[PDB]
Amino acid sequence: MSTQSNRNALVVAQLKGDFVAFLFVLWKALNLPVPTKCQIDMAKVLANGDNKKFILQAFRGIGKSFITCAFVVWSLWRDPQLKILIVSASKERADANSIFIKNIIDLLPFLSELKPRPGQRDSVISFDVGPANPDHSPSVKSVGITGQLTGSRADIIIADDVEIPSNSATMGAREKLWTLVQEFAALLKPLPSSRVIYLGTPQTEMTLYKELEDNRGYTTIIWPALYPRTREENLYYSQRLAPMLRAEYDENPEALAGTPTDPVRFDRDDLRERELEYGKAGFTLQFMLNPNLSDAEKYPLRLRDAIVAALDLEKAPMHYQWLPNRQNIIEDLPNVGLKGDDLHTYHDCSNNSGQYQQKILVIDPSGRGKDETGYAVLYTLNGYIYLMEAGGFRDGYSDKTLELLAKKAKQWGVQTVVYESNFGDGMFGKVFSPILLKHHNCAMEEIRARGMKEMRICDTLEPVMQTHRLVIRDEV
């Protein structure tokens, strides 16, 4: 039984965390820690099974240390007779983190508890020093670069409040070899958990903004905000109000500038928007009167010009069908025509309508977002399905367009979007286009349209951005 349970905890961190990690209360004695949805999400994200490198952009006044401690415990307690853990921090701050990890360890049952060799010996700063084997060492990040290089067979690095470590560039550079091509690859094959976990609240457009952006440009992990603490979701009268009054009360007895600083994890010197306002201000449009359908013609088709079309179909009322047509001929890609409509009550008459614009633009190849309606419209305008249109782009034969499976396509599609629009490789003419960009901002860990706005136009340009990366696109 013991072997099965130990192994169970070993590869199911959530179960280990919910069952064995305790706090010792004064009224109820040793009780189970009541994990929160954000903490549970964070535990899953930090595991050998998933990635290796994780970065959290969290707000302040979230009991993050409670989870970070449970993870670090779980790591050392279930390591394959191996592994050194070190943290980078300017304090005593890293000592506080390991204290909590020790608070977790000390409450474990015998069978899950490895024997303790060292434990804050000599009033440090360290547990399980020397072969035993796993260890956790609290370190100042200000010293290390020294701490990173000096470590012998490092397995995990946790970096507390990474955004508030001054002169981090050298310490960060020291980290690169430890993770990036890389003893990390070699240790991961051995099943060496560890790994690099960074968690902290943002601090302007420093080094961390670069880390978060590079991560978010590729993935959408991870960020929780004041609302993650569900206790805030109930007012004084003990009625659910979706943190309406707690937020009001917290805004008062303080400041709005302090509330974004403390409970929002927003970066200072910038809005959320994917496209910088510095660029959104320069963007001019071309006003045009659309057809009976939702077609806006910016520049008419020309013979011997190559066009590309992207289509983000509308799953329901809610939003619109968005078809951009982009002149691909020259070095600078211009948007020459857009179809924007929510009048398509029929799942059914769009393929023909779209086709005449695709045909109008020199048999324009089209890359359709494979959503429920997408897959759909795919078939009707397929070379084989109904309209026999031979210029429908597909990443596979099962998938007659852009498969939206796996997060990455949208991520890099947004990342390439940003580049294309900002470096002025792609020129947008549609008014409603740029207005959607105005509100297509951070929805950590991705981007979306804020309350009461549509992102249909922007999202179908994201498909173009993703398509932009593709080798086949390098001359459709």
Side-chain angles (χ1 to χ4, degrees):
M1 298 181 64
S2 290
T3 61
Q4 295 181 329
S5 183
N6 185 299
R7 293 180 177 275
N8 185 303
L10 183 158
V11 63
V12 71
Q14 183 64 57
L15 181 71
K16 182 64 177 67
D18 294 345
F19 292 31
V20 194
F22 294 36
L23 184 61
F24 179 84
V25 72
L26 188 159
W27 295 356
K28 300 290 295 182
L30 190 58
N31 294 312
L32 298 177
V34 60
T36 179
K37 298 293 296 180
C38 63
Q39 290 181 328
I40 67 177
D41 291 329
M42 223 176 301
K44 287 187 175 183
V45 66
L46 281 65
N48 61 30
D50 63 321
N51 180 354
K52 82 187 160 148
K53 293 183 295 293
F54 296 98
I55 308 308
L56 299 166
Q57 58 163 79
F59 64 95
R60 199 145 275 164
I62 182 62
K64 62 147 193 302
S65 181
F66 293 30
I67 59 187
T68 60
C69 65
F71 175 66
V72 61
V73 67
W74 181 91
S75 183
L76 186 153
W77 293 93
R78 295 295 179 275
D79 293 305
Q81 68 185 48
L82 177 67
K83 292 181 177 66
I84 180 177
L85 182 150
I86 308 299
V87 59
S88 297
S90 188
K91 296 182 181 179
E92 60 184 59
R93 186 177 292 277
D95 294 342
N97 290 278
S98 183
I99 299 307
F100 292 30
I101 80 177
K102 292 167 64 184
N103 289 279
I104 303 301
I105 291 196
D106 184 56
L107 262 38
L108 294 181
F110 297 150
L111 186 156
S112 295
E113 72 179 65
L114 298 181
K115 63 181 181 63
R117 307 185 176 253
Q120 180 183 2
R121 294 181 177 274
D122 178 76
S123 59
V124 298
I125 299 172
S126 184
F127 184 76
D128 293 310
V129 188
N133 196 278
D135 58 315
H136 295 295
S137 313
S139 300
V140 65
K141 187 173 181 299
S142 301
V143 66
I145 68 176
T146 65
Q148 290 181 64
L149 295 176
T150 61
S152 179
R153 68 185 177 79
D155 296 335
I156 195 166
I157 300 176
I158 60 172
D160 189 340
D161 80 324
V162 55
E163 193 45 345
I164 305 181
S166 298
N167 196 77
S168 178
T170 60
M171 183 62 171
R174 295 296 183 271
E175 183 284 332
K176 293 294 295 182
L177 291 178
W178 296 95
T179 61
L180 185 160
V181 73
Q182 50 215 47
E183 296 76 7
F184 181 82
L187 295 177
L188 293 181
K189 297 182 176 181
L191 297 176
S193 54
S194 314
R195 305 145 67 79
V196 177
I197 297 73
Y198 305 148
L199 184 164
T201 66
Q203 178 197 300
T204 302
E205 293 292 0
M206 293 184 306
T207 185
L208 181 161
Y209 178 86
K210 296 293 295 181
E211 72 186 47
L212 181 60
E213 64 181 58
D214 188 330
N215 293 119
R216 184 180 296 174
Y218 183 83
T219 60
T220 55
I221 72 174
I222 304 180
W223 178 99
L226 184 66
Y227 62 91
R229 295 180 64 185
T230 187
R231 294 180 64 86
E232 298 183 293
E233 309 198 324
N234 296 123
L235 275 51
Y236 295 151
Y237 178 87
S238 297
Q239 68 291 1
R240 297 283 168 189
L241 175 76
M244 300 171 60
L245 183 61
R246 182 63 179 181
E248 296 181 55
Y249 182 81
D250 186 54
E251 180 286 326
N252 296 337
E254 73 181 56
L256 272 95
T259 305
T261 297
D262 180 341
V264 178
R265 176 85 192 55
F266 180 82
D267 295 335
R268 296 293 180 276
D269 182 71
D270 180 17
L271 190 62
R272 293 194 297 272
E273 61 179 348
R274 60 173 176 96
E275 294 297 321
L276 185 61
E277 179 286 330
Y278 181 82
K280 294 184 57 74
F283 297 151
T284 185
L285 298 157
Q286 181 180 0
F287 182 83
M288 183 62 72
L289 183 160
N290 66 25
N292 298 116
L293 295 176
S294 68
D295 193 331
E297 292 291 358
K298 297 296 180 295
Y299 296 96
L301 185 64
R302 299 291 180 275
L303 294 176
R304 298 178 61 85
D305 293 339
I307 305 297
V308 299
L311 179 62
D312 183 21
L313 297 176
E314 61 177 299
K315 297 179 66 69
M318 294 279 94
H319 303 70
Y320 286 67
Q321 179 184 66
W322 184 255
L323 178 79
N325 293 120
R326 301 291 297 177
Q327 184 62 264
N328 72 59
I329 56 172
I330 62 173
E331 183 286 329
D332 187 329
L333 302 178
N335 190 357
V336 297
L338 283 68
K339 296 288 300 178
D341 56 24
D342 63 24
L343 293 178
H344 294 174
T345 179
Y346 294 33
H347 181 271
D348 309 296
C349 63
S350 179
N351 290 115
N352 291 116
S353 62
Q355 183 181 57
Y356 292 97
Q357 294 298 322
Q358 294 297 98
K359 185 63 180 64
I360 287 168
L361 297 174
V362 63
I363 65 174
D364 180 68
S366 183
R368 309 186 282 282
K370 290 180 71 66
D371 61 33
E372 67 184 51
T373 303
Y375 293 94
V377 168
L378 314 172
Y379 66 78
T380 298
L381 185 168
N382 183 335
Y384 183 81
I385 305 297
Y386 300 149
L387 294 176
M388 298 182 64
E389 182 286 338
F393 185 81
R394 61 177 180 278
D395 8 288
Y397 284 126
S398 182
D399 296 332
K400 295 294 295 181
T401 44
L402 185 158
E403 183 179 59
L404 181 166
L405 185 163
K407 300 280 183 172
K408 186 177 179 297
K410 186 192 180 190
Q411 293 302 102
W412 186 90
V414 177
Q415 182 180 60
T416 307
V417 68
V418 69
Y419 294 152
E420 297 184 46
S421 55
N422 290 279
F423 292 32
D425 188 328
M427 183 181 68
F428 293 29
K430 182 59 180 62
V431 307
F432 294 26
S433 195
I435 68 176
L436 277 61
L437 281 56
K438 297 182 177 61
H439 70 80
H440 187 56
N441 68 51
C442 302
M444 188 67 171
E445 315 68 4
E446 305 191 326
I447 305 301
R448 294 299 289 177
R450 62 176 179 279
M452 183 63 74
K453 290 181 172 83
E454 291 295 352
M455 64 173 84
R456 293 296 180 175
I457 85 190
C458 66
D459 292 343
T460 314
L461 284 172
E462 183 287 328
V464 176
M465 302 293 130
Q466 183 60 265
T467 62
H468 182 201
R469 205 159 39 188
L470 296 177
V471 60
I472 303 300
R473 183 173 177 283
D474 64 28
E475 278 182 323
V476 65

